[PDB]
């Protein structure tokens, strides 16, 4: 069959790009091998945040509730109820995506697509062709090459767990590892986080990784630094022992590898089409998401750009705007992208870390404002938690170039500040806005 | 007589903020406070109210949302004395923090009630003190209706003094304080009734907000009673109270809270002696710079009739001290586009014009509204789904944003940054060119179509 536009992959980039193209009168197909919504709906953003809210409830009950006067017994934590509630919600989201594609008159093809040539794809026996093809195949979890690697599960396997294990080891140091260790610790399992160097989230502003270690030392998970996995041994009683190169070992009931992800660009016969990948296997794209082959584009996690859904969505929509709505220079600016990590406590960051701003503008130019306070929710309890915020300003005008915070409230406060940063906010702009009291967010507009 | 450069009558939000900033530029200052430092906000307002909102959030997490997340829990005991002890200890720590700053600033704090002797002289505890600049920042107090049995009701000060949680509670009023208190008390488990005089609470807020709030109250409490005009309160034989309305409806509760309004506390300090003029409602009249009619006397905060919020008293007090003592002859607070959060169930955040106000001021042809409505993800997996509704109000070709309104989980922390953007003159394009953060409620404002 022939189409104007085909997107291979029904994840964040594929759905956003095909719906926007279909609005401009293009006849479109979307090929998806598994579930609509991709990694973020099914094994990513959405089920992760439900599990985070579940940890938050268990912490309100068990950790903070006693100092607020609530003596509570958790009679049972029914894991199947939570998974059944999470699954029904994701099923409702699937139905909504289908409804939107249908209204848009997009043909959804369920199957695994491979290139025959630059303009031709085979899917389920059938051959289809199009003048514009978007490869938005995402990625998948990496696994280390060590003895016993196969006794560990990865983030996909975490969402498929039948019960919460008693003792859990999470290996990795990026935001996924930190979020999963934070959620599993919050639900009551004995949780260990193993990072290779001295702290998780090493690329984040120092204030953020410092505070997170602080919190972890006070409330779990148990952090183990300088940990290089060497082997995993399955024990007679079925437990696992993770061996570190330095001789340390830990015996857990479940081990999750959360070391990194790799691109899923490999069994689709890119060779036929002549699309060039880079060393790491990412599809190489220019500013405009163009591959080396005229008429083939890539967006999302398979291009090696930052691995976030809003980025695959925004790049995918701007691409359909360029191709089909004659906006020849439309493209995503990949700077000043806001990130929230659903750690305990949450992290929000946009712009340059203080080290980056100093390297780029010089210490002479950089003024940093910082605030450290106890989160009001925790201030009346014996489990007080820090909240730390930093504004990084450059020049005499103190133009804001980085906003960073860790503490309750960071997840919802950051979006509006990211709009202000994108507009070119100076410290004066923030100070001239009246605070909202009592909130964590008013700290950014009353820094001195 | 002791003589000061600057004296503030009232140690609450505006008095403390103004005196500290004056003291920073070397002015010798006195602060007179008749009760506790921090004023209404610290002692019977912002701070204890938010601590009780958190306690209602924890009881809702245990009792309402937790079972659908798989937690089967028994609340063995809700110890109110423990909650009140934690709350009170926290406020005592804040009193100490204020004392520390004022002390480091060499401000003389006088505990007693001040009254004017003439335009430059105050008497406090039999002593006389004088100053070249006097700031009246006396705040306000709860109003009470003039009807039989009003004294069987308490007001919001009395709420923070409750010795226990009553089983049945009536809150009478329709503004943000009645709404917050009724949602907290309901969240804490009491049978709660909210009585409003017309069709909905928060009638001055954008219609989307009062509408959604009614929906939520009808689904999860408090019980809302509209067109309610209190006629009398009867104390019954058993101790309960029956509130009787003008149209003949009646309700028997164990506690009744008046949260109908607040009046200025400007009536017992002998303003006459100083020559200061107040308006019909008893507020002190000030200009753009917080000047009263008497040269050298100024007023800020709730006793001027401006918007009754702590950040506004603070910002106007600090800018007044900059204008007077740090050579900024034009410094003053812009009272437009002040953001507000209401800690209702769910919270509300608003800044700028409501859709009605924007249509009246700019005409229907100029106004473009964008709206979004969805289920809060926290509640979406439970049997107690709660709406989240958001609205951007835009004007002109450029779609300049003039109002941002929302009700739903997350509105309390997301609004500050969008208020900065609105203050910067943001258009809908500026929100649209910012990359979203997923999954949040706040990303809805940058992806509206
Ligand atoms: C545990 C976890 C948590 C995360 N949390 C967040 C978060 O909270 N916020 C956030 O912004 N980001 C989050 N992310 C990242 C986000 O999920 C990704 O960045 C986003 O999904 C990437 O979009 P995409 O379009 O590139 O690919 P994907 O969503 O991965 O989708 C690609 C689709 O291609 C399909 N497919 C692959 N090859 C073929 C083929 N040849 N034929 C047909 N179909 C094919 C796949 O089945 C898949 O559905 C998270 C990721 C993980 C793993
Ligand atoms: C229940 C409730 C909840 C609220 N919640 C919020 C909120 O969450 N956020 C928010 O921004 N605002 C909130 N407010 C509003 C806020 O509390 C007020 O706007 C703020 O306190 C006003 O500051 P002020 O300086 O004008 O007066 P106040 O804080 O009231 O202080 C005035 C002070 O003057 C003292 N005084 C009076 N007369 C004399 C005298 N002659 N001599 C000596 N001392 C005297 C009083 O004892 C008092 O301490 C709330 C108010 C209430 C009642």
UniProtKB/Swiss-Prot annotation, chain A:
Keyword set includes Cell membrane: no
Molecular function terms from GO: FAD binding; flavin adenine dinucleotide binding; glutathione-disulfide reductase (NADPH) activity; NADP binding
Additional remarks: The active site is a redox-active disulfide bond.
Record note on pH: Optimum pH is 7.5.
PROSITE patterns, per database record: PYRIDINE_REDOX_1 (PS00076)
UniProt source species: Escherichia coli (strain K12)
Pfam family, one: Pyr_redox_2
Annotated NADP(+) binding sites: 173, 176, 179, 196, 202, 260, 307, 340
UniProt function note: Catalyzes the reduction of glutathione disulfide (GSSG) to reduced glutathione (GSH). Constitutes the major mechanism to maintain a high GSH:GSSG ratio in the cytosol.
Binding residue positions for FAD: 12-13, 32, 39-40, 48, 113, 301, 309, 437
Cofactor note: Binds 1 FAD per subunit.
Subcellular location per the Swiss-Prot or TrEMBL entry: Cytoplasm
EC number: 1.8.1.7
Named cofactor requirement(s): FAD
GO cellular component terms given for this protein: cytosol; membrane
Principal location: cytoplasm
Active-site feature positions: 437 (proton acceptor)
Protein name, as recorded: Glutathione reductase
A biological-process GO annotation: cellular response to oxidative stress
From Swiss-Prot, chain B:
Chain positions recorded as NADP(+) binding sites: 174, 177, 180, 197, 203, 261, 308, 341
Sequence positions that bind glutathione: 13, 98, 318
Cystine connections: 41-46
Principal place of residence: cytoplasm
Cofactor details (free text): Binds 1 FAD per subunit.
GO biological process, any: cellular response to oxidative stress
Signal peptide limits: none
Annotated EC: 1.8.1.7
Named cofactor requirement(s): FAD
pH effects: Optimum pH is 7.5.
GO cellular component: cytosol; membrane
Catalytic activity field: 2 glutathione + NADP(+) = glutathione disulfide + NADPH + H(+)
Note: The active site is a redox-active disulfide bond.
Family stated for the protein in its record: Belongs to the class-I pyridine nucleotide-disulfide oxidoreductase family.
Protein name listed in UniProt: Glutathione reductase
Species for this entry: Escherichia coli (strain K12)
């Amino acid at each position: 069959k022939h189409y104007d536009y085909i997107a291979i992959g029904g994840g964040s980039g594929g759905i956003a790009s095909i719906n926007r193209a279909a609005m401009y009168g293009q006849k479109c197909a979307l090929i998806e091998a598994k579930e609509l919504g991709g990694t973020c709906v099914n094994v990513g953003c959405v089920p992760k945040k439900v599990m985070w809210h579940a940890a938050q409830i268990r912490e309100a009950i068990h950790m903070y509730g006693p100092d607020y006067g609530f003596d509570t017994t958790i009679n049972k934590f029914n894991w199947e109820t939570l998974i059944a509630s999470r699954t029904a919600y994701i099923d409702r989201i699937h139905t909504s995506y289908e409804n939107v594609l249908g209204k848009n008159n997009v043909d959804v093809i369920k199957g695994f697509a491979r290139f025959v040539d630059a303009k031709t794809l085979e899917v389920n026996g059938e051959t289809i062709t199009a003048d514009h093809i978007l490869i938005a195949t995402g990625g998948r979890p990496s696994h280390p090459d060590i003895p016993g690697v196969e006794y560990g599960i990865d983030s996909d396997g975490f969402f498929a767990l039948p019960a919460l294990p008693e003792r859990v080891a999470v290996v990795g140091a990026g935001y996924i590892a930190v979020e999963l260790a934070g959620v599993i610790n919050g639900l009551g399992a004995k949780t260990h986080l193993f990072v290779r160097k001295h702290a998780p989230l090493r690329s984040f502003d120092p204030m953020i990784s410092e505070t997170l270690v602080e919190v972890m030392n006070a409330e779990g998970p148990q952090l183990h630094t300088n940990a290089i996995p060497k082997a995993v041994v399955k024990n007679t009683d079925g437990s696992l022992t993770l061996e570190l190169e330095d001789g340390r070992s830990e015996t857990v009931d479940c081990l999750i590898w959360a070391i990194g992800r790799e691109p899923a660009n490999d069994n689709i016969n890119l060779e036929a089409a002549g699309v060039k990948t880079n060393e790491k296997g990412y599809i190489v794209v220019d500013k405009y998401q163009n591959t080396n082959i005229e008429g083939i584009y890539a967006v999302g996690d398979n291009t090696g750009a930052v691995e976030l859904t809003p980025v695959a969505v925004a790049a995918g929509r701007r691409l359909s705007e360029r191709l089909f709505n004659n906006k020849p220079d439309e493209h995503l600016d990949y700077s000043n992208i806001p990130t929230v990590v659903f750690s305990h406590p949450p992290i929000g960051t946009v712009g340059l870390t203080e080290p980056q701003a100093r390297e780029q503008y010089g210490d002479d130019q950089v003024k940093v404002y910082k605030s450290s306070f106890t989160a009001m929710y925790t201030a009346v309890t014996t489990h007080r938690q820090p909240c730390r915020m930093k504004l990084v300003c450059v020049g005499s005008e103190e133009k804001i170039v980085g906003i960073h915070g860790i503490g309750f409230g960071m997840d919802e406060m950051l979006q509006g500040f990211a709009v202000a940063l994108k507009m070119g906010a100076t410290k004066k702009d923030f100070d001239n806005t009246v605070a909202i009291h009592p909130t964590a967010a008013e700290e950014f507009v009353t820094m001195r």
